[PDB]
Amino acid sequence: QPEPDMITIFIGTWNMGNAPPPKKITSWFLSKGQGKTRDDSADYIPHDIYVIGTQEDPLSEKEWLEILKHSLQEITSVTFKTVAIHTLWNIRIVVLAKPEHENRISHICTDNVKTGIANTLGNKGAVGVSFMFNGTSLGFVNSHLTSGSEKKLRRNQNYMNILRFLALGDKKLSPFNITHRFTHLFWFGDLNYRVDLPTWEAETIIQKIKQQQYADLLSHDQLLTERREQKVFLHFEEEEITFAPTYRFERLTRDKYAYTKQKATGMKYNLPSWCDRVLWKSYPLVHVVCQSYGSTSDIMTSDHSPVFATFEAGVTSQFVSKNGPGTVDSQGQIEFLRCYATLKTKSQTKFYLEFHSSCLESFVKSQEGENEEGSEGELVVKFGETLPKLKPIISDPEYLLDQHILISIKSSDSDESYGEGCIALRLEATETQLPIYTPLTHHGELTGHFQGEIKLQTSQ
Numbered sequence: 001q002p003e004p005d006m007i008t009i010f011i012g013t014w015n016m017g018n019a020p021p022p023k024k025i026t027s028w029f030l031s032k033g034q035g036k037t038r039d040d041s042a043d044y045i046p047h048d049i050y051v052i053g054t055q056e057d058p059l060s061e062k063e064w065l066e067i068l069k070h071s072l073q074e075i076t077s078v079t080f081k082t083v084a085i086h087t088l089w090n091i092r093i094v095v096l097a098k099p100e101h102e103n104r105i106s107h108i109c110t111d112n113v114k115t116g117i118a119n120t121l122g123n124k125g126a127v128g129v130s131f132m133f134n135g136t137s138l139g140f141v142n143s144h145l146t147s148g149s150e151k152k153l154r155r156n157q158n159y160m161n162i163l164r165f166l167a168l169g170d171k172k173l174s175p176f177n178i179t180h181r182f183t184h185l186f187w188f189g190d191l192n193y194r195v196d197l198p199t200w201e202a203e204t205i206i207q208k209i210k211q212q213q214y215a216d217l218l219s220h221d222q223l224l225t226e227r228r229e230q231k232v233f234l235h236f237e238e239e240e241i242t243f244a245p246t247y248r249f250e251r252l253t254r255d256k257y258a259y260t261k262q263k264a265t266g267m268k269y270n271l272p273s274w275c276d277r278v279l280w281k282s283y284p285l286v287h288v289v290c291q292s293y294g295s296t297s298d299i300m301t302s303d304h305s306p307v308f309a310t311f312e313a314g315v316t317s318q319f320v321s322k323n324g325p326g327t328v329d330s331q332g333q334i335e336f337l338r339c340y341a342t343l344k345t346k347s348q349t350k351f352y353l354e355f356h357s358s359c360l361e362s363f364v365k366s367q368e369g370e371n372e373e374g375s376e377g378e379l380v381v382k383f384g385e386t387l388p389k390l391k392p393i394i395s396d397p398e399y400l401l402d403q404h405i406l407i408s409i410k411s412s413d414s415d416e417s418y419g420e421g422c423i424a425l426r427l428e429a430t431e432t433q434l435p436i437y438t439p440l441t442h443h444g445e446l447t448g449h450f451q452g453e454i455k456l457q458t459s460q
Ligand SMILES: CC(=O)Nc1ccncc1C
Pocket: 224, 227, 228, 229, 230, 233, 234, 235, 236, 237
């Protein structure tokens, strides 16, 4: 039974509008409807992992699990295993996997974050799940962010609170938030970003949707515009949107957008919007390909339509050598030349680096760097040829070239991280000096850069 090199992952997000689902929801799991849809020839082929995020979910965990599992069994004739389920209020995440994967999946974590204070604490936030699939770490976040067209800044703040405070993955990676803990991170939900056009343009927008002409709407989508301005979701990818806005529909049809202000909306307009989204972030030079991204047309219980996305994702095996795990492999080493951090900080403390990777027995602290002033005001922290030589547990290039080094630059004064990034060991050559680079972030905002050269020695 060979271990897989690649799996497929289904991501679903649905704001159920506090209504039970209809009797058949199979179109969701088949990626059928509008947008980038899955080929009919794949209908009976199960995805390896199904991750279902709901918002405004009125069902008990048991009720929803029975619907999901019976849906997948009808499609695939496979009885899926429940990996995890976690609910905060009416925000839920379910992870299901093919039974063959049960003994490939370990280190399952769940968490939630509640967003806002007082007034604004009580129904918005996120749930998430992480686990290891053989040698690959996977994270999944379902968030229901603040509603309303004039609250994009609140949504961005909700995003920053969720990635700071959601405690998933390896707790030993203490300087790193969820945006650095996983080989593949999927972030989805009712993110509630709107099409920011004048209220008076509602019927014009509906016309454009009927013509399947999305370009002049997407140019005003708040998630795309905020992400282009580095206000939210920095370093996350999204597949091009080619499906109609998924909100706000009259229930029991899809023929009508319900946009006008009502007492039930707090006298707010809900112009047609792409509230319901799937984004991802994978470590550099790991295979990840979006195969589908769309919405269903035939599930009409809610004022939102379900959204699906599917991915091919590279995975690695749980590697054992004669040496590591349990010792180092002296045939392996990672060296750093001409390295320096450029930081945006106005502060003047000394900095050191920490190197974290599951290819090391434990994280490695460098000596302090030498601070200089950049020509445009910046702090440059020079490590020159001073960084430690990293001793991987396994030297086999089929293992080592698939690994990644997380880097934190920390203040000597406070031991607080000022920036985090990631370097792939998937190099063009071994025993050769090659440029490396990562942006540095802190709380998912850009704080600087790390660049230099690497020299990787493997057993080959
Ligand atoms: C066009 C655009 O917004 N790109 C982007 C922004 C932030 N982070 C990642 C990406 C790929």
